[PDB]
């Protein structure tokens, strides 16, 4: 859905480049359409690690035949909004809990 | 090829801290997701990660005389389509 975290059609490396902007802290995230599985989404998250430094991890959001959405089959959600809320409450396997949506440059006012 | 870790166990234990250990699967693991919480407790579990190169983890700040459920999941790359997958869990219980 056209929610604040939804970036629509966006490639993996472009999502990485945007998330890796200086100023973004760990847990900054976006949701985009998957370019490798049709009908799936990807949750892209800014992360940090002792060895690799600043980095980005991607999690595929797959669709259930009758149910809803999941990254791991043990945690299933009726909507993408419920998935995002869950992973904002607890990381529950993700590299980091979701904090706020990846910022983008807006027109000057 | 195995992605589930095996033979999870506590290998050192004080009243408030545990060292857990397992056998890595044959797939290269990116990181492990570890949870622990009072068995049947009505608070949320604690969660953390360790690097995929490891096969042990230190849990601290436990309450003495509480049964804890401890679970380990491997998060790993399969191929470019399935780039980030969670393994089946392995779990143990331990009373401090």
């Amino acid at each position: 859905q056209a929610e604040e975290w939804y970036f629509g059609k966006m490639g993996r490396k472009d999502a990485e480049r945007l998330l890796l902007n200086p100023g973004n802290q760990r847990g900054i995230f976006l949701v985009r359409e998957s370019e490798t599985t049709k009908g799936a989404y990807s949750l892209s998250i800014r992360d940090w690690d002792e060895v690799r430094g600043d980095n980005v991890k991607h999690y595929k959001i797959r669709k259930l035949d009758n149910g809803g959405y999941y990254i791991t089959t043990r945690a299933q959600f009726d909507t993408l909004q419920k998935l995002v809320k869950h992973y904002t409450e607890h990381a529950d396997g993700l590299c980091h809990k979701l904090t706020t949506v990846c910022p983008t440059v807006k027109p000057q006012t | 090829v195995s992605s589930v870790p095996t033979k999870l166990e506590v290998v050192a234990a004080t009243p408030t801290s545990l060292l857990i250990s397992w056998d890595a699967p044959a797939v290269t693991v990116d990181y492990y997701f570890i949870t622990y919480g009072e068995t049947g407790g009505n608070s949320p579990v604690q969660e953390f990660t360790v690097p995929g190169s490891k096969s042990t983890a230190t849990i601290s700040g436990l309450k003495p005389g509480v049964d804890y459920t401890i679970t380990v999941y491997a998060w790993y790359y399969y191929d470019d389509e399935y780039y980030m997958n969670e393994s089946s869990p392995i779990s143990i219980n331990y009373r401090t």
Side-chain angles (χ1 to χ4, degrees):
Chain A
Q1 191 135 335
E3 308 245 353
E4 177 189 8
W5 38 254
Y6 186 62
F7 279 57
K9 181 168 187 287
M10 178 182 213
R12 188 187 303 169
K13 287 179 98 160
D14 283 337
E16 296 178 0
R17 297 183 180 111
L18 184 69
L19 287 164
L20 290 172
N21 274 2
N24 287 334
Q25 295 190 263
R26 327 162 60 173
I28 294 296
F29 72 99
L30 56 85
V31 176
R32 59 193 177 83
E33 298 179 348
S34 172
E35 308 211 325
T36 49
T37 304
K38 195 52 194 194
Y41 301 90
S42 185
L43 169 63
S44 298
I45 307 174
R46 168 113 180 204
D47 195 30
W48 175 92
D49 162 278
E50 310 88 32
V51 183
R52 40 193 169 183
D54 293 333
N55 71 114
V56 169
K57 302 214 154 56
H58 312 276
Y59 298 85
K60 183 157 292 180
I61 298 169
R62 296 157 83 184
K63 179 61 191 172
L64 288 157
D65 312 41
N66 203 28
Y69 301 90
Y70 70 96
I71 294 165
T72 175
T73 54
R74 59 184 174 89
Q76 303 184 2
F77 307 92
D78 299 319
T79 68
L80 279 183
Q81 293 86 345
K82 286 181 172 184
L83 185 151
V84 170
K85 174 175 142 185
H86 174 87
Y87 289 115
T88 304
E89 283 160 4
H90 306 274
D92 194 21
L94 304 188
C95 59
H96 195 285
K97 71 182 56 183
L98 308 184
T99 51
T100 52
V101 180
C102 184
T104 63
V105 170
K106 313 285 192 48
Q108 287 177 300
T109 56
Chain B
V1 165
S2 65
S3 70
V4 184
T6 52
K7 293 189 277 161
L8 174 66
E9 50 174 350
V10 175
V11 293
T14 66
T16 66
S17 184
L18 309 171
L19 180 64
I20 54 166
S21 175
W22 59 91
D23 290 338
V27 67
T28 296
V29 176
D30 195 312
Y31 63 90
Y32 292 93
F33 170 54
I34 301 177
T35 66
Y36 61 98
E38 181 162 14
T39 302
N42 68 326
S43 302
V45 298
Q46 307 292 121
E47 308 174 347
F48 68 94
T49 62
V50 297
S53 58
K54 309 307 183 183
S55 55
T56 59
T58 309
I59 299 168
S60 300
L62 304 175
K63 318 172 186 175
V66 168
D67 191 89
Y68 287 93
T69 296
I70 301 157
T71 305
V72 176
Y73 309 78
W75 281 87
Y76 66 96
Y77 174 95
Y78 179 107
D79 62 21
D80 186 76
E81 178 179 10
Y82 293 110
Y83 42 76
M84 177 68 90
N85 314 280
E86 192 183 59
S87 78
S88 295
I90 181 165
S91 302
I92 62 175
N93 291 262
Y94 197 83
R95 184 176 167 89
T96 51

